[PDB]
Design a protein around this nucleic acid. Structure first.
Ligand SMILES: [Mg+2]
Ligand SMILES: [Zn+2]
Lengths: 134, 121, 375, 182, 38
RNA sequence: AAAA
RNA sequence: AGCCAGGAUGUUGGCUUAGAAGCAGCCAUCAUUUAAAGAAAGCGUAAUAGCUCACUGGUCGAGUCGGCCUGCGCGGAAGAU
């Protein structure tokens, strides 16, 4: 019953994911191959969040989610890391459509009842990372 | 907490909604997590079913053709504002939470006999 | 966790001194490997895992050590049984008892082909190599941070090649004597492959890494019997890398730390920038040199002959011209912006790196290591 | 640099050691070698002393070159070849050899080393802590002049006066000329 | 037990009690917080 | 588990 | 005041870091569904996890909360025939 943000297809048995599943007991290489086979369609290099569901018989199923908004905002602005001092140092610029584009994909993981509400969550996400909206 | 003005604002708004509605269902929502309520909130908006939680004292002030529904308010209370609301509650309550009373035609509907509104087309 | 337990035939201890001694014949006569497992499993089928006296008298070495390491329900144990029949019979006996005393466990047996100790040429060539593959498979399929080598059972000759794996990869090894009662995490002296000895072989492995096969005679002509184990004969007149070879190839491929050096032109230029910029450049080069991730980030325009520029950051008064040889980070020039701009202005037209290395002996060399005793 | 300090000076601050190993993995692997000695310091654990006393030759003094010496050494390479490099390391290794070489002592702790009769090179060195600082490297002709100047006036004080302007910083005697990497 | 002239509530679970004319502090969560005025 |  | 229940979503906010996921440090502290739920007050974890508080909905059916000014008392308070 663990939640991870492993890479798009770079699901190594490496320490980023390796020891996490070990305490439960699921086969490490089994999950790594299963995750990659369905995330090949995902754009390259994305920390797609997956929630693992392990059982008592040492079996597991997992569900993948849309990429995090902060990741989507980082690629939308063409940057790699956020502002060190958000709302003090400004490190990018994205249009409202770029907010709509990110909101639409994350709408599968949002909770707002409208595109405007979903956007405002993304707008709040943008301010918290120093990315101003332009 | 809530001053008289804020409570007066609540009483008017739920009175306005109760005025422009058609049917009401009173349900229990003690012990159900927010996530399952989040699902109900999406379901209620999709089916155009207004849903709110208010104080029973505030509810009884505003609710006075639902007076027959203003007869069982002791314990946690949830209210929703034709048909398909009791249908939605019965499915969720069976699969999860309970129902207490329903309102229709300005008449009470007992909990066992909400099968009428849950089946009407 | 995962326990890579070596398996030894201490389980059938109860047949000590009885007329047919416990040998591969004895397993054979009683029906076979599976049939003999039940006979062995009977003698200690009752003993517990929490009882101290049974741990030290009535159970195998794998069972005693595993019970001491704290085997639980959520565990996975591997038994590297021997190739001999008497070895495998006990393997099928330990597993039945382990899957009985701790239900919900996953024990699987690997039969290391050719692990017999009655022949030398086979053991030197197929035993340790196969055992080296099997262990290195499980560690790489479960991460170095989760495997615990258990070199207590089995022959005394496998133990060198279990612990040595632990030292190289990083997994620990835990051992416990029969009469003792304390688990001993064996010391892990940091070791690696001798880069100096192995460096001339780099082009040789390069062919194999590309064309995946080389004729044997050409391999022998190209290249000291220790190097032989690095190479496994595929069998059709070619040779490919043995499992040890893949370790060496990766060791000769992993990036390492670097120690900066300064050409005679850099040392003249560093000092005149020290007065205006404190001792900032001294730390930056050392910081970049001893961090491979920092080095790969800062590569500005790359020049010929393996030169590539570095810079502290935006709007800085220094940009370095460095290149790598062995474990040394040679620094050729250290120039400010205007000299840097003109160099790149010149390099637009023709080649640049050729002109620098051409005068290496007259102007830049010798490179002196970056240790300073300013006082 | 750190291990040589730890071998001579008993312990070093950990903060200096932490700066030397930026990667977390490096500290994790090399954790066994070092050992906390108290007062925010680390020292070589007996495992470390075994490895270090195996991969490093013994020594008594670590040679260093001033800037003027470096040019002096380079220009003499055409005549004496690599002999100055070997004689410096040998002197720094064995105090018995260093004691033999002392022929004339100047002020402020500077003395001249001559490898013997029939030779041409001569060195002007001084010992600080555990470092063998080398100030100049001269030939037979200049050596007489430098004795004449010191004969009249103090010349040891003149050199130490120009310490921060011509001589320091002292690089270490580790060169790399041929194209080869291990 | 601390015996001080000034006794105070050290955390949220400390209680001030007077027993036989002595102001005492009793803490249900931390035995180090028990003090007595004297 | 001090020649499995 | 006690007792029952909830205490969530963007999101692991960004920076830093091997890890920094409310809870080592820095900056910001918005937004959504909301009866209500801090970009978290406390505990905890190698980091996650887990616990609690703030906040709100129920049960109960008359008062309740902390400041100020002031009279008299209490502790602080152990010595030698
Ligand atoms: Mg008084
Ligand atoms: Zn307390």
């Amino acid at each position: 019953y663990v939640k991870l943000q492993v890479a798009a297809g770079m699901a190594n048995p490496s320490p980023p994911v390796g020891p996490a599943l070990g305490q439960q007991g699921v086969n490490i290489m089994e999950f790594c191959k299963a995750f990659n086979a369905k995330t090949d369609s995902i754009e390259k290099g994305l920390p797609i969040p997956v929630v693992i569901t392990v059982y008592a018989d040492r079996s597991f199923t997992f569900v993948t989610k849309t990429p995090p908004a902060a990741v989507l905002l980082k690629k939308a602005a063409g940057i790699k890391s956020g502002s060190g001092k958000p709302n003090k140092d400004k490190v990018g610029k994205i249009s409202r459509a770029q907010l709509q584009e990110i909101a639409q994909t994350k709408a599968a993981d949002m909770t707002g009842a409208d595109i405007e509400a979903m956007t405002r969550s993304i707008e709040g996400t943008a301010r918290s990372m120093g990315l101003v909206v332009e | 907490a809530l001053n008289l003005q804020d409570k007066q604002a609540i009483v008017a708004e739920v009175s306005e909604v109760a005025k422009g509605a058609l049917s009401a269902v009173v349900a229990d929502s003690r012990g159900v997590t927010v996530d399952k309520m989040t699902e109900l909130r999406k379901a209620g908006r999709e089916a155009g079913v207004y849903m709110r939680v208010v104080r029973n004292t505030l509810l009884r002030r505003a609710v006075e053709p639902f007076e027959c529904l203003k007869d069982a308010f002791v314990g946690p209370t949830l209210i929703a504002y034709p048909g398909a609301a009791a249908r939605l509650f019965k499915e969720f309550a069976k699969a999860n939470f309970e129902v207490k009373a329903a309102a229709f035609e300005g008449e009470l509907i007992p909990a066992s006999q909400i099968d009428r509104l849950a089946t009407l087309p | 966790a995962v326990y890579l337990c070596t398996c030894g035939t201490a389980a059938a201890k109860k047949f000590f001194g009885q007329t047919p001694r416990f040998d591969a014949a004895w397993v054979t006569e009683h029906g076979g490997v599976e049939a003999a497992s039940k006979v062995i499993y009977d003698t200690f089928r009752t003993a517990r895992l929490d009882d101290e006296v049974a741990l030290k008298r009535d159970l195998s070495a794998e069972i005693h050590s595993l019970a001491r390491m704290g085997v639980n329900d959520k565990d996975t144990v591997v038994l590297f049984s021997s190739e001999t029949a008497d070895g495998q019979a006990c393997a099928w006996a330990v597993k039945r008892y382990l899957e009985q005393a701790r239900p919900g466990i996953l024990c699987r047996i690997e039969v290391v082909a050719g692990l017999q100790v009655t022949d030398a040429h086979v053991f030197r060539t197929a035993g340790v190599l196969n055992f080296t593959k099997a262990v290195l498979h499980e560690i790489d399929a479960n991460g170095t941070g989760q495997c615990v080598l258990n070199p207590t059972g089995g022959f005394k000759s496998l133990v060198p090649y279990t612990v040595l794996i632990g030292m190289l990869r990083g997994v620990p090894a835990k051992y416990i004597f029969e009469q003792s009662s304390a688990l001993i995490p064996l010391p892990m002296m940091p070791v690696e492959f001798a880069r100096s000895r192995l460096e001339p072989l780099r082009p040789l492995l390069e062919r194999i890494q590309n064309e995946t096969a080389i004729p044997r005679a050409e391999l022998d002509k190209a290249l000291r019997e220790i190097l032989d184990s690095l190479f496994e004969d595929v069998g059709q007149g070619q040779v490919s890398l043995s499992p040890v070879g893949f370790l060496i190839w990766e060791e000769l491929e992993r990036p390492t730390a670097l120690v900066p050096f300064l050409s005679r032109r850099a040392l003249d230029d560093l000092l005149k920038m020290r007065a205006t910029e404190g001792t900032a450049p001294d730390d930056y080069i050392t910081r970049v040199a001893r961090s491979p991730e920092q080095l790969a980030i800062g590569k500005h325009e790359s020049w010929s002959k393996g030169l590539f520029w570095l810079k502290r950051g935006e709007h800085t008064r220094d940009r370095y011209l460095v290149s790598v040889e062995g474990w040394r980070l040679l620094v050729w020039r250290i120039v400010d912006a205007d000299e840097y701009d003109d160099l790149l202005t010149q390099n637009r037209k023709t080649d640049a790196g050729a002109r620098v290395v051409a005068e290496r002996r007259e102007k830049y060399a010798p490179f002196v290591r970056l240790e300073l005793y300013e006082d | 640099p750190l291990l040589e300090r730890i071998q001579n000076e008993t312990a070093i601050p950990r903060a200096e050691l932490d700066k030397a190993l930026p990667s977390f993995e490096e500290r994790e692997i090399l954790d066994s070698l070092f050992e906390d000695v108290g007062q925010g310091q680390v020292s070589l654990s007996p495992v470390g002393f075994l490895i270090w006393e195996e991969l490093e030759r013994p020594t008594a003094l670590v040679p260093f070159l001033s800037r003027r010496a470096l040019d002096d050494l380079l220009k003499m390479r055409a005549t004496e070849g690599t002999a100055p490099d070997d004689y410096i390391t040998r002197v720094a290794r064995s105090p018995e050899q260093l004691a033999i070489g002392k022929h004339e002592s100047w002020s402020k702790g500077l003395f001249w080393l001559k490898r013997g009769e029939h030779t041409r090179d001569r060195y002007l060195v001084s010992v600080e802590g555990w470092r063998l600082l080398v100030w100049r490297i001269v030939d037979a002709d200049e050596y007489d002049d430098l004795l004449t100047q010191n004969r009249k006036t103090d010349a040891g004080a003149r050199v130490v006066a120009e310490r921060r302007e011509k001589y320091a910083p002292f690089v270490r005697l580790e060169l790399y000329e041929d194209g080869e990497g291990w | 037990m601390k015996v001080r002239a000034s006794v105070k509530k050290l955390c949220r679970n400390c209680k001030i009690v007077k027993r036989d004319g002595v102001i005492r502090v009793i803490c249900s969560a931390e035995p180090k917080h028990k003090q007595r005025q004297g």
